[PDB]
Amino acid sequence: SYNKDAVFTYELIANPDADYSDQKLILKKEISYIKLNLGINQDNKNAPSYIFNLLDDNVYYGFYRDTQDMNRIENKYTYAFKKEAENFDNLQKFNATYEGQFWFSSIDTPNVPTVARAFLTYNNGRVDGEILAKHWNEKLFQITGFDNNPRKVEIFPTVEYLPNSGTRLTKGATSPHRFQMDLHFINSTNGEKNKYLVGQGSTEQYWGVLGMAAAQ
């Protein structure tokens, strides 16, 4: 049921008559399947309904916009991968480094997409990494292995306020605002094993998706 040729999204149609009455801001929610090209896919550069990053024919990540009450809009982060392309090798002594991006929104700005840079190192099973601000080397999150499983990480904040947010987080490894993430190693269509790494997670205060590529 993976199909980068028909990716689910919502078209959210503004209700014009809400300009002059107490009707919902959104008139209708309509399903709309997108066919992805390699790289960044979006319909509008300044008010996109969705952004998806097809890293490879076998895996994408991104978000589409949703609303539960037809008034408030929030980004829904997701990822998908060809099932057969997932790598199930034993990665307990894995040696590799990944570089990519973390896309997220915060509870007080649920429709505002924040992009950060992400780095993850596998050294003989030890899993450690970091999430940095897009344009400068400020550390936003620490990444660490969870439960001695190379496919599970724990991500915890190292700042009290994320970009574009005024929601105060607690910092550090015992922070109740940390979260755990299941990761999936995806092989490339050009025969690179474990080339791509995707997962997603959430807390009450922020939620997002992680997508990464191996350093060759």
XYZ file of N, CA, C and O in Angstrom:
864
model
N 0.812 -1.216 0.000
C 0.000 0.000 0.000
C 0.856 1.283 0.000
O 0.339 2.382 0.204
N 2.161 1.130 -0.217
C 3.023 2.262 -0.517
C 2.830 2.695 -1.962
O 2.793 1.867 -2.876
N 2.734 4.002 -2.178
C 2.560 4.518 -3.535
C 2.989 5.983 -3.551
O 2.201 6.862 -3.187
N 4.224 6.240 -3.984
C 4.633 7.634 -4.127
C 4.022 8.288 -5.363
O 4.290 9.467 -5.634
N 3.228 7.545 -6.121
C 2.497 8.091 -7.248
C 1.097 8.554 -6.869
O 0.404 9.133 -7.704
N 0.669 8.315 -5.636
C -0.659 8.718 -5.203
C -0.632 8.923 -3.700
O -1.140 8.082 -2.953
N -0.011 10.024 -3.256
C 0.204 10.305 -1.837
C -1.010 11.044 -1.292
O -1.469 12.024 -1.889
N -1.537 10.578 -0.163
C -2.751 11.185 0.372
C -2.501 12.602 0.887
O -1.535 12.852 1.621
N -3.388 13.533 0.521
C -3.434 14.848 1.159
C -4.876 15.321 1.176
O -5.775 14.683 0.620
N -5.074 16.455 1.836
C -6.348 17.145 1.906
C -6.208 18.464 1.165
O -5.225 19.185 1.354
N -7.179 18.791 0.339
C -7.356 20.170 -0.080
C -8.301 20.817 0.928
O -9.390 20.295 1.170
N -7.882 21.917 1.550
C -8.723 22.624 2.517
C -9.251 23.894 1.861
O -8.494 24.843 1.630
N -10.547 23.918 1.568
C -11.146 25.007 0.804
C -11.723 26.029 1.767
O -12.664 25.730 2.519
N -11.167 27.240 1.722
C -11.649 28.331 2.553
C -13.106 28.639 2.235
O -13.533 28.606 1.073
N -13.876 28.925 3.285
C -15.273 29.305 3.124
C -15.330 30.811 2.898
O -15.145 31.577 3.859
N -15.601 31.283 1.673
C -15.710 32.743 1.460
C -16.725 33.408 2.373
O -16.436 34.455 2.966
N -17.915 32.821 2.512
C -18.976 33.424 3.316
C -18.634 33.490 4.801
O -19.418 34.054 5.568
N -17.511 32.903 5.230
C -17.049 33.104 6.599
C -16.479 34.496 6.814
O -16.303 34.906 7.968
N -16.176 35.216 5.727
C -15.758 36.615 5.797
C -16.820 37.517 6.417
O -16.479 38.583 6.941
N -18.098 37.133 6.353
C -19.180 37.998 6.809
C -20.206 37.263 7.676
O -21.304 37.785 7.895
N -19.883 36.073 8.187
C -20.798 35.342 9.056
C -19.993 34.416 9.969
O -18.765 34.311 9.862
N -20.707 33.736 10.875
C -20.099 32.881 11.889
C -19.917 31.431 11.425
O -19.837 30.522 12.260
N -19.838 31.193 10.121
C -19.624 29.856 9.599
C -18.156 29.452 9.736
O -17.266 30.299 9.870
N -17.912 28.131 9.692
C -16.551 27.608 9.721
C -15.683 28.302 8.673
O -16.150 28.667 7.589
N -14.400 28.482 9.012
C -13.439 29.071 8.082
C -13.187 28.181 6.869
O -12.847 28.681 5.787
N -13.352 26.870 7.016
C -13.075 25.933 5.938
C -14.389 25.343 5.471
O -15.151 24.778 6.267
N -14.654 25.503 4.180
C -15.916 25.081 3.593
C -15.947 23.576 3.367
O -16.959 22.924 3.646
N -14.868 23.007 2.841
C -14.858 21.577 2.608
C -13.453 21.011 2.754
O -12.453 21.719 2.622
N -13.408 19.721 3.054
C -12.184 18.940 3.146
C -12.276 17.897 2.048
O -13.198 17.075 2.057
N -11.366 17.960 1.078
C -11.400 17.086 -0.092
C -10.084 16.335 -0.227
O -9.012 16.942 -0.107
N -10.161 15.020 -0.464
C -8.944 14.224 -0.609
C -8.298 14.536 -1.955
O -8.972 14.809 -2.948
N -6.973 14.486 -2.001
C -6.261 14.885 -3.215
C -4.960 14.102 -3.249
O -4.112 14.285 -2.376
N -4.806 13.210 -4.220
C -3.608 12.381 -4.287
C -2.538 13.058 -5.138
O -2.807 13.504 -6.259
N -1.338 13.152 -4.590
C -0.212 13.814 -5.235
C 0.716 12.749 -5.800
O 0.953 11.707 -5.166
N 1.256 13.011 -6.982
C 2.310 12.186 -7.558
C 3.634 12.895 -7.297
O 3.799 14.056 -7.687
N 4.559 12.223 -6.608
C 5.781 12.874 -6.143
C 6.906 12.750 -7.161
O 7.085 11.701 -7.783
N 7.674 13.823 -7.308
C 8.958 13.769 -7.994
C 10.073 13.648 -6.959
O 9.858 13.807 -5.756
N 11.278 13.363 -7.430
C 12.401 13.284 -6.506
C 12.659 14.662 -5.903
O 12.523 15.688 -6.576
N 12.982 14.687 -4.616
C 13.242 15.945 -3.952
C 12.005 16.576 -3.357
O 11.089 15.871 -2.928
N 11.963 17.904 -3.332
C 10.921 18.633 -2.613
C 9.690 18.776 -3.504
O 9.792 19.200 -4.660
N 8.521 18.432 -2.969
C 7.258 18.570 -3.687
C 6.324 19.452 -2.874
O 6.062 19.170 -1.698
N 5.820 20.512 -3.497
C 4.783 21.326 -2.872
C 3.995 22.022 -3.972
O 4.477 22.187 -5.097
N 2.776 22.429 -3.641
C 1.926 23.019 -4.672
C 2.091 24.529 -4.784
O 1.958 25.083 -5.886
N 2.406 25.194 -3.677
C 2.616 26.632 -3.624
C 3.853 26.864 -2.769
O 4.054 26.180 -1.760
N 4.687 27.824 -3.175
C 5.912 28.078 -2.423
C 5.654 28.843 -1.127
O 6.402 28.667 -0.159
N 4.597 29.663 -1.071
C 4.359 30.534 0.073
C 3.185 30.116 0.946
O 3.164 30.477 2.127
N 2.211 29.383 0.404
C 1.083 28.870 1.185
C 0.811 27.419 0.802
O -0.272 27.076 0.318
N 1.776 26.529 1.029
C 1.636 25.166 0.512
C 0.573 24.397 1.267
O 0.430 24.538 2.483
N -0.184 23.579 0.531
C -1.082 22.634 1.192
C -0.321 21.453 1.784
O -0.804 20.815 2.736
N 0.849 21.142 1.222
C 1.681 20.012 1.623
C 3.113 20.318 1.205
O 3.358 21.070 0.256
N 4.054 19.715 1.914
C 5.424 19.582 1.428
C 5.855 18.138 1.645
O 5.723 17.616 2.758
N 6.369 17.488 0.587
C 6.934 16.143 0.711
C 8.321 16.092 0.093
O 8.563 16.676 -0.970
N 9.221 15.389 0.767
C 10.594 15.160 0.318
C 10.699 13.688 -0.083
O 10.725 12.797 0.776
N 10.714 13.421 -1.389
C 10.987 12.072 -1.890
C 12.504 11.918 -1.973
O 13.146 12.418 -2.900
N 13.084 11.255 -0.974
C 14.523 11.032 -0.951
C 14.950 10.037 -2.011
O 16.099 10.073 -2.475
N 14.036 9.160 -2.399
C 14.300 8.001 -3.225
C 12.934 7.466 -3.607
O 11.942 7.763 -2.935
N 12.872 6.707 -4.701
C 11.585 6.146 -5.102
C 10.979 5.300 -3.987
O 9.752 5.158 -3.916
N 11.814 4.778 -3.081
C 11.363 3.887 -2.019
C 10.915 4.592 -0.735
O 10.425 3.894 0.162
N 11.081 5.913 -0.582
C 10.757 6.545 0.707
C 10.598 8.066 0.570
O 11.429 8.755 -0.037
N 9.546 8.590 1.199
C 9.341 10.027 1.315
C 8.965 10.387 2.747
O 8.587 9.531 3.552
N 9.092 11.670 3.074
C 8.529 12.179 4.317
C 8.005 13.583 4.054
O 8.352 14.220 3.054
N 7.153 14.061 4.947
C 6.655 15.413 4.735
C 5.447 15.691 5.609
O 5.310 15.126 6.694
N 4.591 16.587 5.125
C 3.369 16.872 5.865
C 2.293 17.312 4.891
O 2.582 17.761 3.778
N 1.043 17.150 5.318
C -0.103 17.796 4.690
C -0.903 18.502 5.787
O -0.760 18.210 6.980
N -1.743 19.448 5.382
C -2.531 20.221 6.330
C -3.872 19.555 6.610
O -4.526 19.025 5.704
N -4.278 19.577 7.878
C -5.538 18.982 8.285
C -6.240 19.919 9.256
O -5.671 20.902 9.739
N -7.509 19.620 9.518
C -8.284 20.358 10.501
C -9.318 19.402 11.085
O -9.961 18.643 10.351
N -9.464 19.425 12.400
C -10.505 18.615 13.009
C -11.820 19.372 13.156
O -12.884 18.758 13.054
N -11.786 20.694 13.330
C -12.987 21.473 13.608
C -13.366 22.425 12.468
O -14.285 23.234 12.639
N -12.671 22.362 11.326
C -12.910 23.211 10.139
C -12.623 24.687 10.400
O -13.102 25.580 9.670
N -11.871 24.947 11.469
C -11.465 26.302 11.818
C -9.952 26.350 12.007
O -9.279 27.173 11.384
N -9.425 25.473 12.869
C -8.012 25.437 13.240
C -7.262 24.439 12.358
O -7.670 23.279 12.230
N -6.156 24.879 11.765
C -5.385 24.056 10.841
C -4.096 23.621 11.519
O -3.446 24.414 12.207
N -3.731 22.351 11.341
C -2.473 21.860 11.886
C -1.771 20.997 10.851
O -2.408 20.327 10.032
N -0.443 21.042 10.888
C 0.375 20.195 10.029
C 0.352 18.756 10.532
O 0.517 18.507 11.733
N 0.160 17.805 9.619
C 0.175 16.372 9.934
C 1.422 15.776 9.290
O 1.452 15.570 8.074
N 2.448 15.503 10.094
C 3.681 14.951 9.543
C 3.547 13.449 9.349
O 2.854 12.745 10.100
N 4.204 12.959 8.311
C 4.125 11.545 8.011
C 5.326 11.166 7.151
O 6.141 12.013 6.777
N 5.440 9.871 6.876
C 6.449 9.304 5.995
C 5.899 7.977 5.515
O 5.002 7.403 6.132
N 6.464 7.481 4.425
C 6.066 6.189 3.915
C 7.230 5.604 3.134
O 8.077 6.333 2.602
N 7.272 4.278 3.078
C 8.357 3.608 2.383
C 7.854 2.295 1.795
O 6.941 1.654 2.334
N 8.432 1.929 0.656
C 8.168 0.626 0.075
C 8.552 -0.455 1.074
O 9.692 -0.494 1.564
N 7.586 -1.328 1.376
C 7.780 -2.350 2.399
C 8.987 -3.225 2.088
O 9.814 -3.489 2.968
N 9.123 -3.652 0.835
C 10.197 -4.571 0.478
C 11.564 -3.917 0.588
O 12.571 -4.626 0.698
N 11.616 -2.585 0.543
C 12.873 -1.859 0.607
C 13.391 -1.687 2.027
O 14.519 -1.210 2.198
N 12.609 -2.053 3.040
C 13.080 -1.907 4.405
C 14.154 -2.945 4.705
O 14.081 -4.098 4.272
N 15.175 -2.518 5.424
C 16.301 -3.370 5.768
C 16.122 -3.882 7.192
O 15.937 -3.090 8.120
N 16.168 -5.203 7.360
C 15.958 -5.826 8.660
C 17.229 -6.457 9.206
O 17.160 -7.286 10.117
N 18.384 -6.077 8.666
C 19.651 -6.620 9.125
C 19.844 -6.364 10.615
O 19.187 -5.516 11.228
N 20.749 -7.138 11.196
C 21.219 -6.892 12.549
C 22.155 -5.695 12.523
O 23.232 -5.751 11.922
N 21.753 -4.614 13.174
C 22.548 -3.399 13.204
C 23.113 -3.144 14.593
O 23.253 -1.991 14.996
N 23.435 -4.212 15.337
C 23.927 -4.032 16.701
C 25.376 -3.563 16.728
O 25.804 -2.965 17.718
N 26.161 -3.845 15.685
C 27.512 -3.298 15.575
C 27.631 -2.358 14.372
O 28.698 -2.244 13.769
N 26.535 -1.686 14.016
C 26.483 -0.820 12.840
C 27.413 0.382 12.996
O 27.511 0.978 14.075
N 28.106 0.733 11.911
C 28.958 1.919 11.850
C 28.518 2.761 10.659
O 28.679 2.348 9.505
N 27.984 3.944 10.933
C 27.449 4.780 9.868
C 27.128 6.140 10.451
O 26.968 6.287 11.667
N 27.032 7.140 9.574
C 26.590 8.460 9.991
C 25.518 8.947 9.029
O 25.616 8.734 7.814
N 24.497 9.599 9.579
C 23.372 10.078 8.800
C 23.260 11.587 8.933
O 23.621 12.178 9.959
N 22.754 12.204 7.873
C 22.546 13.635 7.853
C 21.247 13.908 7.111
O 20.999 13.330 6.046
N 20.425 14.785 7.673
C 19.137 15.076 7.079
C 18.408 16.184 7.804
O 19.029 17.179 8.202
N 17.092 16.047 7.966
C 16.290 17.147 8.478
C 15.231 16.640 9.445
O 14.772 15.508 9.343
N 14.863 17.491 10.398
C 13.729 17.248 11.288
C 12.698 18.330 11.015
O 13.012 19.519 11.130
N 11.479 17.931 10.648
C 10.404 18.875 10.375
C 9.386 18.798 11.505
O 8.913 17.706 11.826
N 9.011 19.943 12.078
C 8.123 19.880 13.230
C 7.300 21.152 13.375
O 7.610 22.199 12.799
N 6.224 21.030 14.153
C 5.422 22.157 14.563
C 5.184 22.040 16.058
O 5.262 20.946 16.629
N 4.880 23.184 16.678
C 4.621 23.290 18.107
C 3.143 23.584 18.358
O 2.424 24.079 17.487
N 2.703 23.319 19.592
C 1.271 23.334 19.882
C 0.678 24.732 19.747
O -0.468 24.876 19.305
N 1.445 25.785 20.079
C 0.951 27.155 19.951
C 1.077 27.710 18.535
O 0.447 28.731 18.234
N 1.830 27.056 17.653
C 1.875 27.412 16.232
C 1.712 26.153 15.374
O 2.604 25.781 14.598
N 0.548 25.484 15.475
C 0.418 24.132 14.905
C 0.480 24.081 13.396
O 0.709 22.995 12.851
N 0.268 25.194 12.703
C 0.334 25.210 11.246
C 1.653 25.765 10.723
O 1.818 25.873 9.505
N 2.589 26.111 11.600
C 3.843 26.755 11.195
C 4.904 25.677 11.069
O 5.333 25.113 12.089
N 5.374 25.355 9.853
C 6.371 24.289 9.684
C 7.759 24.794 10.038
O 8.241 25.762 9.448
N 8.404 24.138 10.998
C 9.783 24.449 11.363
C 10.678 23.330 10.836
O 10.320 22.151 10.911
N 11.809 23.707 10.245
C 12.763 22.776 9.651
C 14.067 22.906 10.443
O 14.529 24.018 10.701
N 14.644 21.783 10.844
C 15.939 21.784 11.524
C 16.849 20.761 10.856
O 16.380 19.879 10.141
N 18.159 20.889 11.061
C 19.101 19.910 10.522
C 19.298 18.788 11.539
O 19.339 19.038 12.748
N 19.444 17.552 11.052
C 19.581 16.385 11.927
C 20.790 15.538 11.546
O 21.102 15.363 10.360
N 21.447 14.992 12.571
C 22.685 14.230 12.432
C 22.631 13.050 13.388
O 22.272 13.214 14.558
N 23.001 11.874 12.912
C 22.911 10.685 13.753
C 24.080 9.776 13.423
O 24.309 9.463 12.248
N 24.808 9.352 14.451
C 25.958 8.477 14.286
C 25.707 7.136 14.952
O 25.305 7.077 16.118
N 25.986 6.075 14.214
C 25.990 4.704 14.705
C 27.446 4.277 14.793
O 28.110 4.141 13.764
N 27.952 4.086 16.003
C 29.336 3.660 16.194
C 29.332 2.384 17.031
O 29.266 2.443 18.265
N 29.409 1.235 16.357
C 29.542 -0.054 17.030
C 28.356 -0.254 17.980
O 28.480 -0.728 19.106
N 27.178 0.151 17.514
C 25.980 0.056 18.323
C 25.611 1.300 19.110
O 24.421 1.575 19.288
N 26.599 2.042 19.615
C 26.307 3.326 20.246
C 25.646 4.266 19.244
O 26.171 4.494 18.151
N 24.495 4.816 19.624
C 23.690 5.686 18.770
C 23.603 7.058 19.437
O 23.029 7.189 20.529
N 24.165 8.080 18.786
C 24.135 9.444 19.309
C 24.002 10.453 18.170
O 24.584 10.277 17.096
N 23.241 11.512 18.404
C 23.139 12.536 17.382
C 22.566 13.816 17.938
O 22.435 13.988 19.153
N 22.203 14.710 17.024
C 21.766 16.036 17.425
C 20.922 16.647 16.320
O 21.029 16.272 15.150
N 20.044 17.553 16.727
C 19.199 18.327 15.831
C 19.559 19.798 16.018
O 19.469 20.340 17.133
N 20.048 20.413 14.951
C 20.494 21.788 14.947
C 19.531 22.664 14.161
O 18.825 22.206 13.257
N 19.554 23.946 14.506
C 18.792 24.938 13.779
C 19.241 24.960 12.323
O 20.395 24.654 11.991
N 18.309 25.326 11.449
C 18.574 25.213 10.024
C 19.765 26.054 9.602
O 20.610 25.585 8.835
N 19.853 27.306 10.075
C 20.818 28.251 9.530
C 21.996 28.547 10.451
O 22.897 29.255 10.036
N 22.043 28.004 11.667
C 23.214 28.206 12.524
C 23.309 27.018 13.480
O 22.347 26.275 13.659
N 24.479 26.858 14.104
C 24.762 25.676 14.909
C 24.264 25.777 16.349
O 25.028 25.578 17.301
N 22.986 26.072 16.516
C 22.325 25.981 17.809
C 21.731 24.581 17.952
O 20.986 24.120 17.076
N 22.071 23.897 19.044
C 21.507 22.577 19.291
C 20.108 22.706 19.892
O 19.942 23.277 20.983
N 19.110 22.160 19.185
C 17.723 22.120 19.632
C 17.389 20.844 20.382
O 16.627 20.877 21.356
N 17.907 19.711 19.925
C 17.608 18.423 20.534
C 18.862 17.579 20.539
O 19.710 17.689 19.649
N 18.936 16.707 21.520
C 19.903 15.628 21.558
C 19.209 14.335 21.149
O 18.068 14.085 21.547
N 19.896 13.508 20.362
C 19.406 12.176 20.007
C 20.256 11.119 20.683
O 21.492 11.172 20.639
N 19.593 10.103 21.217
C 20.320 9.015 21.840
C 19.571 7.706 21.646
O 18.349 7.681 21.459
N 20.331 6.612 21.670
C 19.735 5.304 21.506
C 18.774 4.984 22.635
O 18.965 5.391 23.778
N 17.716 4.246 22.303
C 16.686 3.881 23.276
C 16.579 2.364 23.349
O 16.371 1.711 22.322
N 16.711 1.808 24.554
C 16.456 0.381 24.786
C 17.416 -0.524 24.000
O 17.065 -1.649 23.652
N 18.639 -0.056 23.719
C 19.646 -0.840 22.977
C 19.091 -1.402 21.664
O 19.444 -2.500 21.222
N 18.212 -0.639 21.035
C 17.601 -1.015 19.761
C 18.078 -0.008 18.723
O 17.796 1.194 18.871
N 18.837 -0.412 17.697
C 19.297 0.572 16.695
C 18.158 1.233 15.950
O 18.375 2.257 15.290
N 16.952 0.666 16.008
C 15.793 1.247 15.355
C 14.892 2.027 16.308
O 13.766 2.372 15.935
N 15.354 2.323 17.520
C 14.607 3.184 18.427
C 15.532 4.264 18.967
O 16.601 3.957 19.508
N 15.124 5.526 18.825
C 15.848 6.620 19.457
C 14.933 7.367 20.426
O 13.697 7.330 20.338
N 15.583 8.071 21.350
C 14.975 9.052 22.233
C 15.534 10.419 21.883
O 16.751 10.582 21.735
N 14.652 11.397 21.751
C 15.033 12.749 21.383
C 14.606 13.674 22.516
O 13.441 13.652 22.929
N 15.546 14.455 23.048
C 15.152 15.359 24.118
C 15.616 16.782 23.842
O 16.661 16.995 23.212
N 14.830 17.776 24.259
C 15.188 19.170 23.968
C 16.408 19.610 24.751
O 16.645 19.175 25.885
N 17.201 20.472 24.110
C 18.317 21.161 24.749
C 18.117 22.669 24.731
O 19.071 23.416 24.933
N 16.893 23.135 24.450
C 16.519 24.540 24.564
C 15.156 24.584 25.232
O 14.391 23.614 25.201
N 14.852 25.734 25.830
C 13.565 25.897 26.484
C 12.470 26.321 25.511
O 11.287 26.090 25.780
N 12.828 26.941 24.385
C 11.835 27.382 23.409
C 12.347 27.017 22.027
O 13.465 27.392 21.657
N 11.537 26.284 21.280
C 11.880 25.900 19.926
C 11.673 27.093 19.011
O 10.983 28.045 19.377
N 12.281 27.088 17.827
C 11.995 28.154 16.863
C 10.496 28.242 16.609
O 9.804 27.221 16.542
N 9.996 29.481 16.512
C 8.590 29.783 16.214
C 7.647 29.360 17.332
O 6.481 29.077 17.071
N 8.113 29.292 18.580
C 7.243 28.820 19.650
C 7.512 29.574 20.939
O 8.650 29.955 21.231
N 6.448 29.765 21.715
C 6.571 30.317 23.047
C 6.140 29.324 24.111
O 5.833 29.719 25.244
N 6.095 28.035 23.748
C 5.774 26.955 24.682
C 7.053 26.538 25.392
O 8.011 26.109 24.742
N 7.066 26.655 26.711
C 8.281 26.406 27.476
C 8.456 24.907 27.685
O 7.595 24.257 28.290
N 9.563 24.368 27.181
C 9.971 22.986 27.392
C 10.973 22.871 28.533
O 11.747 23.793 28.801
N 10.973 21.710 29.187
C 12.031 21.337 30.119
C 13.155 20.641 29.364
O 12.900 19.798 28.504
N 14.396 21.013 29.663
C 15.549 20.455 28.960
C 16.067 19.189 29.643
O 15.820 18.939 30.827
N 16.815 18.395 28.882
C 17.603 17.326 29.460
C 17.004 15.944 29.234
O 15.892 15.773 28.722
N 17.773 14.937 29.667
C 17.492 13.547 29.323
C 16.321 12.960 30.099
O 15.769 11.941 29.670
N 15.955 13.538 31.246
C 14.768 13.111 31.975
C 13.593 14.055 31.746
O 12.648 14.074 32.547
N 13.626 14.813 30.668
C 12.580 15.781 30.418
C 11.278 15.063 30.096
O 11.267 14.143 29.263
N 10.166 15.447 30.723
C 8.868 14.900 30.307
C 8.464 15.343 28.911
O 7.502 14.795 28.356
N 9.199 16.277 28.308
C 8.943 16.740 26.954
C 9.845 16.074 25.928
O 9.935 16.561 24.798
N 10.537 14.998 26.303
C 11.227 14.182 25.324
C 10.241 13.205 24.694
O 9.089 13.086 25.116
N 10.696 12.491 23.671
C 9.863 11.437 23.109
C 10.742 10.381 22.475
O 11.932 10.593 22.226
N 10.127 9.234 22.214
C 10.797 8.100 21.608
C 10.298 7.935 20.181
O 9.146 8.255 19.865
N 11.185 7.460 19.319
C 10.852 7.304 17.914
C 11.312 5.957 17.352
O 12.457 5.536 17.582
N 10.402 5.281 16.641
C 10.749 4.091 15.869
C 11.350 4.522 14.540
O 10.752 5.324 13.827
N 12.522 3.989 14.208
C 13.223 4.293 12.968
C 13.186 3.104 12.014
O 13.164 1.945 12.443
N 13.203 3.407 10.709
C 13.173 2.408 9.647
C 14.316 2.673 8.683
O 14.395 3.765 8.113
N 15.174 1.666 8.480
C 16.289 1.734 7.538
C 15.829 1.271 6.159
O 15.338 0.153 6.017
N 15.983 2.131 5.151
C 15.451 1.893 3.811
C 16.609 1.791 2.830
O 17.483 2.660 2.809
N 16.598 0.753 1.999
C 17.595 0.627 0.943
C 17.206 1.474 -0.268
O 16.025 1.681 -0.553
N 18.213 1.973 -0.980
C 17.951 2.830 -2.126
C 17.660 1.996 -3.365
O 17.980 0.804 -3.438
N 17.050 2.642 -4.359
C 16.832 1.954 -5.625
C 18.130 1.778 -6.397
O 18.187 0.950 -7.310
N 19.173 2.533 -6.051
C 20.485 2.371 -6.658
C 21.387 1.433 -5.860
O 22.615 1.508 -5.989
N 20.811 0.565 -5.031
C 21.573 -0.499 -4.409
C 22.385 -0.129 -3.187
O 23.199 -0.948 -2.743
N 22.209 1.065 -2.624
C 22.884 1.394 -1.374
C 22.049 0.855 -0.212
O 20.865 1.188 -0.088
N 22.653 0.020 0.633
C 21.930 -0.542 1.768
C 21.889 0.455 2.919
O 22.873 1.145 3.203
N 20.741 0.521 3.590
C 20.567 1.404 4.736
C 20.852 2.859 4.377
O 21.333 3.633 5.204
N 20.562 3.244 3.133
C 20.883 4.593 2.675
C 20.022 5.645 3.363
O 20.493 6.761 3.609
N 18.774 5.316 3.701
C 17.836 6.311 4.201
C 17.254 5.864 5.540
O 17.106 4.667 5.798
N 16.923 6.844 6.382
C 16.438 6.594 7.736
C 15.318 7.573 8.039
O 15.535 8.787 8.017
N 14.126 7.048 8.330
C 12.952 7.863 8.596
C 12.278 7.366 9.865
O 12.343 6.181 10.199
N 11.650 8.295 10.583
C 10.778 7.979 11.706
C 10.045 9.236 12.111
O 10.319 10.324 11.595
N 9.085 9.083 13.030
C 8.340 10.254 13.490
C 7.917 10.082 14.941
O 7.883 8.971 15.475
N 7.574 11.202 15.575
C 7.140 11.145 16.956
C 6.457 12.426 17.386
O 6.338 13.387 16.619
N 6.018 12.435 18.645
C 5.286 13.590 19.149
C 5.298 13.616 20.668
O 5.486 12.594 21.328
N 5.111 14.815 21.199
C 4.654 15.079 22.556
C 3.416 15.953 22.459
O 2.962 16.288 21.363
N 2.891 16.367 23.614
C 1.792 17.321 23.587
C 2.237 18.674 23.039
O 1.429 19.386 22.434
N 3.515 19.038 23.217
C 3.980 20.390 22.907
C 4.504 20.542 21.472
O 4.504 21.653 20.921
N 4.963 19.465 20.858
C 5.490 19.557 19.504
C 5.462 18.166 18.887
O 5.415 17.155 19.594
N 5.497 18.122 17.558
C 5.410 16.857 16.839
C 6.117 17.017 15.497
O 6.166 18.122 14.949
N 6.692 15.931 14.985
C 7.427 16.056 13.739
C 7.879 14.734 13.146
O 7.532 13.652 13.622
N 8.680 14.850 12.085
C 9.135 13.716 11.291
C 10.615 13.911 10.963
O 11.065 15.029 10.689
N 11.370 12.820 10.990
C 12.808 12.835 10.776
C 13.136 12.040 9.518
O 12.716 10.887 9.389
N 13.919 12.626 8.617
C 14.319 11.921 7.409
C 15.778 12.175 7.102
O 16.220 13.329 7.065
N 16.542 11.109 6.881
C 17.992 11.232 6.822
C 18.606 10.327 5.766
O 18.019 9.324 5.365
N 19.792 10.701 5.303
C 20.499 9.947 4.280
C 21.898 9.648 4.795
O 22.476 10.453 5.525
N 22.426 8.487 4.443
C 23.749 8.114 4.922
C 24.811 8.958 4.233
O 24.709 9.263 3.041
N 25.818 9.366 4.994
C 27.039 9.876 4.382
C 27.703 8.750 3.588
O 27.981 7.676 4.131
N 27.933 8.983 2.301
C 28.511 7.973 1.425
C 29.965 7.652 1.790
O 30.785 8.557 1.946
